[PDB]
Amino acid sequence: EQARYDAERRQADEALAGVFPAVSIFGSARTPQNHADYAFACRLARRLSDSGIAVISGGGPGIMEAANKGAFAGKSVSVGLNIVLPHEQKPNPYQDIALRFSRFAERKAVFFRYSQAYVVMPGGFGTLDELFEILTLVQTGKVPPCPIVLVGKAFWSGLAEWINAQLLARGLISEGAVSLFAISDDEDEIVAYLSEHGLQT
Amino acid sequence: EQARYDAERRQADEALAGVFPAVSIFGSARTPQNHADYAFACRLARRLSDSGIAVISGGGPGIMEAANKGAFAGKSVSVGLNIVLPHEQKPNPYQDIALRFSRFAERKAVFFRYSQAYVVMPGGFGTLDELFEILTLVQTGKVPPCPIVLVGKAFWSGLAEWINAQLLARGLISEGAVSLFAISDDEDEIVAYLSEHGLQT
Amino acid sequence: PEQARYDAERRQADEALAGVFPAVSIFGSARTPQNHADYAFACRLARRLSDSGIAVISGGGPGIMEAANKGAFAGKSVSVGLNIVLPHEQKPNPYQDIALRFSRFAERKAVFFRYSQAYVVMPGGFGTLDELFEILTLVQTGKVPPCPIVLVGKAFWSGLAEWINAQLLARGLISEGAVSLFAISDDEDEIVAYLSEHGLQTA
Amino acid sequence: NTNRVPEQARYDAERRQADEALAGVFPAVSIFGSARTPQNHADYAFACRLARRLSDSGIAVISGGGPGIMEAANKGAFAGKSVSVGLNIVLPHEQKPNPYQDIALRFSRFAERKAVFFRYSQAYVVMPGGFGTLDELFEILTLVQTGKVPPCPIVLVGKAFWSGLAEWINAQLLARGLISEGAVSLFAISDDEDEIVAYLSEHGLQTA
16 A cells, blocks of 8 residues: 555656656636636646646646646646546546556645646635645745746635735734735736746746 | 655554544644633643543644643643644644654644544644645545534634635535534534544543 | 934845845855955856846955855846945945945844845854854744755865754754755755755746 | 834834843843753753852843743842843744743844843853854854954853864864954853853953
8 A cells, every 4th residue: 555655656756757847737627628717727738838838737627637738739748647536537638647646645746846836726625735735835945935826816816815814914824925826817927927936938 | 765754654653553532633833822722722622632532733832732731631642743844843842642754744644544533723824734635635535524623713714705605606616515614613512513523532 | 313324224225125036145254365266166156146047145345255246246137245334344345236234233134134035155254153043043933934055165064064963953952954954065056956946046 | 105114113112121121230141052951951950050150149140031041041040139131032933931030021033132132241151052042152253253242251161062163163264264363262161160150250240
């Protein structure tokens, strides 16, 4: 069992040893193909791929598929980190490097080892897990600083307002903690902000 | 490096092999000793410990110390899962079992392997990491169902309202997903709800 | 009359450095001669960081401070001197795009630690060790965000690191992670890779 | 810019509160050292006894007000005839004041805290400590070296603990010319309370 987890770790490290730079795109497994956010994530991933940036996603349906689809059609590699779950996430067919993980831990370690920026489409608890984990790892200095962009102002604004009204206001986090992420609805604004903060087109 | 992480994993498994049942208490490293939430978490942990439940916390300052302090004064073991960080978290002196982790991954694996319930005091990004990770692991069936209680209605309500208005409303999560957690300000309400949903006093 | 002067020096620095990001501070001895290997190393490093878009902040005097400003001044990014008023007057070196002045060490170090995202520490005396242990303390206690700290000169620094490991860490006077707060190197490539890999926003 | 009270107002207020409390406090010594030294460590007993001796000879004792050596210093000074001062620091991870302070002050930042140590002390005793202790040590050495504060005795306690550092200073700083021979003479190292007290008095600390 531990044997398998380590093996899945070693396979991902081999497969990705030559991949740089890279962005991770997170978001809902449930977003339909005809949704605005699906088209958005696909075109963004296409654009980033064509400027030499690899795209890593969870490799399943929904936003993971939109991201892989765009990047599969772009110049750079499309990477998928499929998670094995009772409620099955079928791997999408738009991956140059197709990896599989039995556990969330090794999956996220690959995300955070091999990415230098993060785009977060709207998602559920698992996307919020990813979001607050990378915020934690950055704030604590366990991974290097990197841009984190939430996409969808109507969706995300209420979370940011709650973070300011409750976490910042009570001193549970510092002012610089709130600055670790930005929110945007604009593809141009997003790609600019990513390169402005260290992503290497 | 990988050697050390595995070693820290094995030490925790040895140290905790005889500990059951158990609750985890999460919350801010920054909560001062004279805060209401600090007193609350301490008395709750005291009460739970006296009814035969072990208490696991992050083993550092703030809420982690309040929880260890109460449980250290209770009949059952007090457990601390200290995390090594640049911004140092000094281990508090109220731990029967004092463990140390170089990485968040092994630390949370111990939390989630050895607990059957969760109490979440107000906290920052790292507490939200823990919260949405256990929600994800439960919702996906990677760990068994278990009660998850957020403490502090004024603090937490705005997050729950955002989850309903945005995640549930858009179908990103199901109605049963929102039911995986409850919010309370009352020690009696909390201990009842914990045993009502499987915690074994 | 007095606090107002320090306030004005602080605001002058905030005004001047408002758009300056990213930035690295380089510390080291005022006494290092212009023909010394460490002077050349700091100059070459500062030039390379500068050409990668990183501003370079030094204490603005002679020695390592001048080597750092000289390399940064020749590079694409700005060269900042934080010049200190000493009873034995220290003359500012000629290689500053932004020349700031401070009556006290306190405001000077506050500016270093507010406007830098990484530190490179050449060999120096008591004033360099004040800076070094101050930034380590500020990081350890959560007053300043964690950032790369590189000590340059394996032979020069190794004795201090071995004493820290044996007599501080092994007595529990520092945390197990406190030794990971800094690295020691004397390869320019190694150092540039380390600064990038750990947060310094390199080109 | 938004209309707000400046951050600086807090540091000004904390410095004024310190000056109010310490106005008539003279002479005084600062005792530095690890927050982490156990109560049963030899360093803790040494610092407590020394602080009591200095206090009974008329010398106020200033420490950082927390646990460890700070608690040992304040404990000895509190029992002694002269005042026991704590310069407590406010940190994201709370540091709890020790119960042995006649004068208890609070600082939001290390800078104002150290300014108070250095304005109100005429001598320094440094028990073994970590990075924050070494910050204090090399900061006061720098301020004395450069003439920002008047000459004063600085004593490191524990020849064996400090020897590795003193040897490194000699082999690397002094031998490479980064400091002068006069610089090394700015601090003494001692194991002995009688020798320490004599040294402090010989270099200007006003004993009874």
